[PDB]
Amino acid sequence: GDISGINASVVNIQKEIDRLNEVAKNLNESLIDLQELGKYEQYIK
Amino acid sequence: LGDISGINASVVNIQKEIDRLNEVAKNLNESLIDLQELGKYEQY
């Protein structure tokens, strides 16, 4: 029963979530440019 | 009393944020996979 260590672990976890939100936005930005560039590529199967 | 109810509410909120990020991760991968499938047919 840490009493207050739980508040701190929650605060820390939220920081990890903030990080993952930033990473996810950044991955999406890069993915979106590949999609836009991919419309002009020659695809031949 | 109010302490525990404050911690449960933070946990519930955190899990909702995780659920959304799981969906984001899955959706990013679905789009990435379609680019991988097409890219093998691209002329270089």
């Epitope: - | 969906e23 990013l28 379609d34 097409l38």
Partner: nanobody
Framework: QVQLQESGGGLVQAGDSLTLSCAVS????????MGWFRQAPGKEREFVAA????????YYADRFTISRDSAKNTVDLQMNSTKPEDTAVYYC???????????????????????WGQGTQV
Amino acid sequence: QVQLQESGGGLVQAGDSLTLSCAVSGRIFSTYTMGWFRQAPGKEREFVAAVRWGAGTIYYADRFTISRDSAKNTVDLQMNSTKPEDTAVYYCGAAYVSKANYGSLWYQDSRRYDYWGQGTQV
């Protein structure tokens, strides 16, 4: 990379059924999603239905039947029990890969499609 040509529109009395068709030309891949949209005068393009070209998964806006013929390379929209609110120009569009990175309901958003036909009026 694909060109789309709609057909089958025109005048119809309410209650009658009508079948639209979209002829796909060019290089189609399994990653494609074909969608039917409609635009009445002065309003915005509204999603009707979509189909994933490879797997054949079908999506409807939450009376219309969408299907695709991968032999002839067409996507067809059957309109049953016509109503006066169905008067619009109907558009065939194609998204060449999944845009799910925009959200799980991305295929309902006409901005996510990449190629468009000229439309056929109903």
